[PDB]
Amino acid sequence: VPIAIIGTGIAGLSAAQALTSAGHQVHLFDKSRGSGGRMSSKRSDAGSLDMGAQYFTARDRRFATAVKQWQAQGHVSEWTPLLYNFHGGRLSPSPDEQVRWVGEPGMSAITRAMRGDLPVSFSCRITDVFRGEQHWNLLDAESENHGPFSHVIIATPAPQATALLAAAPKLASVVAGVKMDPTWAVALAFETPLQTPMQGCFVQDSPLDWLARNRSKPGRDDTLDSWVLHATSQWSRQNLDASREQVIEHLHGAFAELIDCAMPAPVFSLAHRWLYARPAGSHEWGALSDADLGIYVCGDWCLSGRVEGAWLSGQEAARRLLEHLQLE
Amino acid sequence: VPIAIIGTGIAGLSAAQALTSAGHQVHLFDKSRGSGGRMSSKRSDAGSLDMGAQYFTARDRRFATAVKQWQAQGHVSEWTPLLYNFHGGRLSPSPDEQVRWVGEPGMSAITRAMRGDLPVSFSCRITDVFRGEQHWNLLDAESENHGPFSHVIIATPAPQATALLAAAPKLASVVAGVKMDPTWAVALAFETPLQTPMQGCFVQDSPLDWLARNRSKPGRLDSWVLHATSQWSRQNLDASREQVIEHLHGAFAELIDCAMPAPVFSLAHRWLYARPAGSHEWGALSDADLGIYVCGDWCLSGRVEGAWLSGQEAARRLLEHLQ
Ligand SMILES: Cc1cc2nc3c(=O)[nH]c(=O)nc-3n(C[C@H](O)[C@H](O)[C@H](O)COP(=O)(O)OP(=O)(O)OC[C@H]3O[C@@H](n4cnc5c(N)ncnc54)[C@H](O)[C@@H]3O)c2cc1C
Ligand SMILES: Cc1cc2nc3c(=O)[nH]c(=O)nc-3n(C[C@H](O)[C@H](O)[C@H](O)COP(=O)(O)OP(=O)(O)OC[C@H]3O[C@@H](n4cnc5c(N)ncnc54)[C@H](O)[C@@H]3O)c2cc1C
Ligand SMILES: NC(=O)c1ccc[n+]([C@@H]2O[C@H](COP(=O)([O-])OP(=O)(O)OC[C@H]3O[C@@H](n4cnc5c(N)ncnc54)[C@H](O)[C@@H]3O)[C@@H](O)[C@H]2O)c1
Numbered sequence: 001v002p003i004a005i006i007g008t009g010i011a012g013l014s015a016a017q018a019l020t021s022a023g024h025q026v027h028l029f030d031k032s033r034g035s036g037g038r039m040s041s042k043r044s045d046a047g048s049l050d051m052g053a054q055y056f057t058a059r060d061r062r063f064a065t066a067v068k069q070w071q072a073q074g075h076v077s078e079w080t081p082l083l084y085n086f087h088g089g090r091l092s093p094s095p096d097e098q099v100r101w102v103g104e105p106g107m108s109a110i111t112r113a114m115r116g117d118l119p120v121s122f123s124c125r126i127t128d129v130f131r132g133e134q135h136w137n138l139l140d141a142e143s144e145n146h147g148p149f150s151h152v153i154i155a156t157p158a159p160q161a162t163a164l165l166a167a168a169p170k171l172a173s174v175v176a177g178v179k180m181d182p183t184w185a186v187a188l189a190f191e192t193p194l195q196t197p198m199q200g201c202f203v204q205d206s207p208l209d210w211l212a213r214n215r216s217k218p219g220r221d222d223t224l225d226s227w228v229l230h231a232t233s234q235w236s237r238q239n240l241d242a243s244r245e246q247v248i249e250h251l252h253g254a255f256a257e258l259i260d261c262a263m264p265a266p267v268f269s270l271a272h273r274w275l276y277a278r279p280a281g282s283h284e285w286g287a288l289s290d291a292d293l294g295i296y297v298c299g300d301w302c303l304s305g306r307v308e309g310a311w312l313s314g315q316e317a318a319r320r321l322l323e324h325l326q327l328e
Numbered sequence: 329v330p331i332a333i334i335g336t337g338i339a340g341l342s343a344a345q346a347l348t349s350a351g352h353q354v355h356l357f358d359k360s361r362g363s364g365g366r367m368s369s370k371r372s373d374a375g376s377l378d379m380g381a382q383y384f385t386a387r388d389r390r391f392a393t394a395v396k397q398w399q400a401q402g403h404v405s406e407w408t409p410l411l412y413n414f415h416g417g418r419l420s421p422s423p424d425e426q427v428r429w430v431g432e433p434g435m436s437a438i439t440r441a442m443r444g445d446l447p448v449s450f451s452c453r454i455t456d457v458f459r460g461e462q463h464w465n466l467l468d469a470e471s472e473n474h475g476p477f478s479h480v481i482i483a484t485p486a487p488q489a490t491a492l493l494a495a496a497p498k499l500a501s502v503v504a505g506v507k508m509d510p511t512w513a514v515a516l517a518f519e520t521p522l523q524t525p526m527q528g529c530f531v532q533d534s535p536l537d538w539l540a541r542n543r544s545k546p547g548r549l550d551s552w553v554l555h556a557t558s559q560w561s562r563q564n565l566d567a568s569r570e571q572v573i574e575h576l577h578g579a580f581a582e583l584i585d586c587a588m589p590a591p592v593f594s595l596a597h598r599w600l601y602a603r604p605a606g607s608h609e610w611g612a613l614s615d616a617d618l619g620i621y622v623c624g625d626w627c628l629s630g631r632v633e634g635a636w637l638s639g640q641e642a643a644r645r646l647l648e649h650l651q
Contacts, residue, residue, distance in 0.1 A: 031469075125469060127453075128487075128600060130510075132566035139600075141453060141469055147566060162504055163491035166601075172504035176490055177497050182458075241460035241475065275456055275467075276494075 002027045002119075003321070004138055004149035006126050006164060009037025010307055011298045012155030013114040014314025020118065022322050027149070028118055029138065031125035034108070035115045038274065038300075039307065041106030046189035046268045047214070047222035050107040052277075054212050054228055055079055055100040056307035062315070063308045067101055075109040076101050077218040081199035086206065086258040094202060104219040121146070129154070129164045129295070136294060151294040153317050157276035158301045168290050171297060175288065178301050181233040182240055183277035186251040189268040193225040196261040207235040207254045224267070229255055233277070244271040279305035286316035291324040330355045330447075331646070332466055332477040334454050334492060337365025338632055339623045340483030341442040342639025348446065350647055355477070356446055357466065359453035362436075363443045366602065367632065369434030372595060374517040374551035375542065376434030379597045382540050382553065383407055383428040384632035390640070391633045395429055403437040404429050405546040409527035414534065414583045422530065432547035449474070457482070457492045457620070464619060479619040481642050485601035486626045496615045499622060503613065506626050509558035510565055511602035514576040516591040517551040523586040535560040535579045549592070554580055558602070569596035604630040611641040616649040 002025040005012045013035065016026045034040065038052040058064040070076040079102040083094040103109040125141040135148030154161045158178035165172035199216035203209050210230040214220050229251045231239075239247065248269045256263055279301040288297040298317035303309035330353040333340045341363065344354050362368065369376040386395040398404040407430040413422040431437040454474075456467040463476035482489045486506035493500035527544035531537050538555040542548050554576045556564075564572060573594045581588055604626035613622040623642035628634035 130565055130600060133563055135566065137566045145566070159494035159500075160491065162500060163487065165504070166487035166508075169505050169507060172487075172490060173501045176493070176500035176504045179497060180494075238461060240458055241463060241465045241473075275458060 001135060001148050001150045003151045003153065004029065004136060004146070005153045005155055006129075006138070007037065007155030007299075008035035008111065008115060008120065009155060009299075009310060010039055010111055010114070011300065011310040011314040011317075012153065013111050014311045015153050015155060015298060015318040016118055016314075017114055018315055018318030019321065022318070024322075026118060028115065028120035029124050029126055029146075030120070030122050033122050035120070036108040036111040038277070039103070039107050039111050041103070041108035044187075044268070044270065046187070046224040046226045048106045049187050049214070049226060049270070050103075050228065051185050051187060051270070051272045052274065053107060053307055054210070054230070055102050057098065057100060058308055060308055060312060063311055066311065070110055070113065073113060075103060075113045077104050079217055081212065081216045082197055084198050084201040085204075086201055087204040089205065091201075091258055091260055096202075102217050104217075126164060128166065130167055131294070151296065151321055153296045153298060153321070155298050155314060155317070157299060158279075159276055161297055161299070165295070165297070168293055168295050171288055171290055171295065175297060179280040180276035180301060181278055181280050182236045183233060183274045184231040184236045184239065184247050184251070185272050185274070186229040186231075186248050187226055187268075187270045188229070188252060188255070188266040189224040189226040190264060191224065191267045192264070194259070194261050194263060196259065198260065201258065203254070203258065206258070207231050207250055211255060226268075227255070236273075236277075240273070247271040287313055287320060289317065289320050291320060296321055329463060329476050329478045331479045331481065332357065332464060332474070333481045333483060334457075334466070335365065335483030335624075336363035336439065336443060336448065337483060337624075337635060338367055338439055338442070339625065339635040339639040340481065341439050342636045343481050343483060343621075343623060343643040344446055344639075345442055346640055346643035347646070354446060355474075356443070356448040357452050357454050357474070358448070358450055361450050363448070364436045364439040366599065367431070367435045367439055369431070369436035370515070370595065370597070372515065372517070372551070373593050374515075374549035376436065376548070377515050377542060377551060377553060377595070378430070378435040379513045379515060379553060379595070380599065381435055381632055382538065382555070383430050385426065386429060386633060388633055388637060391636055394636065398438055398441070401441060403431060403441050405432045407545050409540070409544050410525050412526045412529040414529055414531040417533065419526065419529070419583060419585050430545050432545075454492060456494065458495055459619070479621065479646055481621045481623060481646070483623050483639060483642075485624060486604075487601055489622055489624070493620070493622070496618055496620050499613050499615060499620070503622065506608070507605040508601040508626060509603055509605050510561040511558060511599045512556040512561045512564065512572050512576070513597045513599065514554040514573050515551055515595040516554070516577060516580065517549040517593050518589065519549065519592050521550040522584065522588060524584065526585075529583075531583065534583060535576055536583070539580065552580070561598075561602075565598070565600075572596045572598075612638055612645060614642065614645050616645055621646055
């Protein structure tokens with residue numbers, strides 16, 4: 001009887017890896033058509049786009065060790081863009097010297113490799129998690145039952161987890177208090193490359209706080225010069241219900257204010273709203289659990305709100321489950 | 329810019345009635361193909377079956393007037409069944425002078441009439457509720473946006489409300505604490521009427537705690553609706569429909585006091601969040617400054633009356649705040 005994992009972002013897949021390494025079968029669920037969550041890459045008319053996390057850093061040694069394995073396997077590489085800063089309405093080079101990692105050929109490659117051939121049900125939105133006398137069961141949005149499962153790991157943003165925790169109301173109440181902040185992201189592509197050496201920019205005093213040039217990322221070689229623009233959470237909140245076209249227009253404007261070359265009209269534009277982009281604050285929980293009941297909860301919001309945090313959180317959920325088994 | 333109401337059970341529709349009576353536009357949402365929620369009737373080979381709420385009492389003077397209005401409209405009538413008890417393993421009559429009401433021709437008639445031609449989006453599961461600087465917005469399970477809305481009323485079972493309250497995490501945490509119990513229901517119909525005078529029964533010491541005979545209701549094959557206890561329903565929460573029918577049919581066959589042949593049709597329905605485990609005294613929950621309101625039976629007594637009163641209270645708080 002396998003363990004159900006709801007969510008195939010890096011937290012859920014990190015838990016899946018740990019459990020399967022320890023000799024336990026899992027079954028993965030995601031409402032999306034594929035895995036990766038906020039690390040996903042989007043195929044588009046302008047090539048593959050990373051519209052969520054663009055890169056990540058690694059400080060914790062356990063996570064850094066995993067990243068170096070992924071690198072050896074060809075799924076991640078360092079990204080060292082020629083960076084600029086825009087502050088006080090002025091553009092300047094930024095000798096930032098920080099190691100940043102990017103999935104290759106796209107950010108989604110990391111989680112795709114973690115998932116491997118583990119059993120998975122995509123386009124399967126779980127709406128209820130409930131237990132009988134012996135086993136756990138999942139109900140999906142089409143009213144189909146899934147189970148039996150021996151345990152459940154919920155690996156979703158906290159607001160999306162609360163509805164799945166009716167069986168564990170003390171946990172549900174904790175999870176319901178975890179605030180996550182929104183982000184609007186925009187992608188623009190140009191038929192000919194912009195005539196600038198800029199490959200990324202940190203932005204202040206602007207609707208934007210970050211932008212990146214996709215062709216500068218390792219293994220990227222799309223004919224179209226695509227750029228991904230990230231709005232601040234404050235701007236995104238203020239504009240949370242703006243239309244996609246207005247968001248595109250405004251962040252395009254912010255980009256045009258800082259750029260150091262001519263910018264023709266884009267041939268493609270996309271906006272994406274992440275309602276629950278990152279946690280508003282940090283925790284040191286690692287995971288949340290009711291091991292006696294058999295329910296575990298994980299995600300970036302259990303720790304630092306970054307890819308590293310999500311991965312560590314999944315490791316911790318799995319560790320607790322495995323410890324409980326070993327003890328039983 | 330209208331008010332969004334998520335949930336078209338009697339709580340949501342009660343809120344809708346109060347708001348539209350006061351001249352405010354609404355838009356209704358439900359994940360189901362129709363309205364009524366836990367009062368809904370199931371169409372079947374034996375006529376409309378009330379698989380959910382079976383009858384209701386009207387004690388509160390305001391609700392009683394509403395019930396009298398519905399009666400005037402031909403949507404409800406008094407139900408005066410010959411009631412029994414199954415106690416100590418024996419069936420005996422249990423008379424009482426309690427007035428009970430039923431929708432006619434089915435329990436669903438009440439909410440259908442409340443809904444009328446109000447704007448509604450069915451097969452529309454709301455997954456997210458969020459606000460900009462001036463308006464509310466809804467996202468559904470197909471990733472389609474809905475809005476702008478001036479306010480939002482959530483009118484769902486409490487565990488289903490928690491996901492819709494991210495914008496109001498203090499309310500979400502309260503709502504997350506509300507326990508609701510499950511109920512399995514089974515319907516059986518017989519080609520010839522069972523030779524018993526019983527028309528309903530309160531049942532003890534059984535998987536069942538209630539059974540009712542539909543042809544005994546005003547305006548309605550001899551079909552019977554069986555309701556399992558919350559304990560039994562919990563113990564069997566992940567049983568198949570076929571297993572539940574088999575087991576609850578067996579339980580009915582154990583208590584009946586006349587010959588009972590094989591039924592010509594059977595149906596089962598699992599209500600995961602059938603009723604609140606306990607009582608509450610909230611009336612409604614709200615953050616009026618934010619513009620979000622929450623209602624449902626679980627805000628009061630866990631009965632039709634409680635749902636109706638809760639919707640009225642949510643609407644009243646909204647209307648009071650508009651000022
Ligand atoms: C715009 C943006 C920029 C970012 N930049 C950075 C950065 O520079 N550095 C960094 O370290 N991090 C960054 N992040 C954060 C990083 O993306 C996240 O911390 C991490 O990816 C979260 O992983 P997770 O597994 O916890 O959740 P997610 O990736 O959100 O995975 C949750 C999964 O659960 C699924 N799901 C949800 N509800 C259900 C349901 N009911 N049924 C089935 N499936 C469900 C979802 O579809 C999703 O696939 C960024 C995020 C965003 C959005
Ligand atoms: C088996 C059973 C027997 C009962 N018997 C009796 C009785 O004899 N007497 C009595 O007084 N009461 C009885 N009740 C209780 C009565 O049915 C309820 O108190 C009442 O109908 C609840 O109304 P409500 O509007 O609060 O919720 P509901 O009727 O549950 O309506 C909620 C609505 O919200 C919708 N919804 C939920 N989530 C979403 C979403 N995310 N997006 C869109 N729509 C959504 C649902 O589809 C549903 O239509 C019984 C209930 C059950 C289950
Ligand atoms: N199936 C479910 O899970 C569920 C969910 C929500 C509400 N409800 C029902 O709401 C119903 C209505 O409660 P109410 O107070 O409005 O109506 P009511 O006064 O008819 O019923 C209340 C309770 O009183 C008892 N009772 C009343 N008359 C009786 C008699 N003649 N013999 C034996 N017992 C008798 C029963 O135990 C009954 O459950 C309850 O009966 C309850 O079953 C059921």
